[PDB]
Amino acid sequence: GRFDHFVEWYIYLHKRTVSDISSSIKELEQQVNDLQRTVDGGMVSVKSLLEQMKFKLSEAIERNDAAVSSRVLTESVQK
Amino acid sequence: GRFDHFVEWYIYLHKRTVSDISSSIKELEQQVNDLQRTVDGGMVSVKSLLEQMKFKLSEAIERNDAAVSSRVLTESVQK
């Protein structure tokens, strides 16, 4: 059995439990609001600075809807 | 002889010839000039997690002095 895989998974679960859950989705969407300043009053072309997070948040939400619904369990519950 | 090493080195030279450092350091300096002016008032959150590229600017300054001080040939000349 892949016990090293278990150790890595358990450590990842503890990292996602001790943090990233008290704030939840609080600071991740804050970067859009912060970078909107450079979008508005900075350079006309700014897509290269906001090309990944825009759909990263959407894919993170569509992956975490399992963790928030009656679906794939939360990290704390699995741990 | 390591022909695979030659192929990697040759492709690297081709990329450095079609990219060069004259059109990469200036863009990094422009990004720094824009970001620093944007964060001039404060709210340095958009510079704390973007400090990585500001340090990679100096990292690009590194590994570059060796290319002019050691009298090494230009990538296009070597190719």
Curated annotation (Swiss-Prot), chains A, B:
Signal peptide as annotated in the record: none
Organism: Escherichia coli
Protein name: Retron Ec78 probable ATPase
Annotated TM spans: none
Function noted in UniProt: Probable ATPase component of antiviral defense system retron Ec78, composed of a non-coding RNA (ncRNA), a reverse transcriptase (RT), this protein and a putative HNH endonuclease. Expression of retron Ec78 confers protection against bacteriophage T5. At multiplicity of infection (MOI) of 0.02 cultures slow growth when infected with T5 but do not collapse, at MOI 2 cultures enter growth stasis.
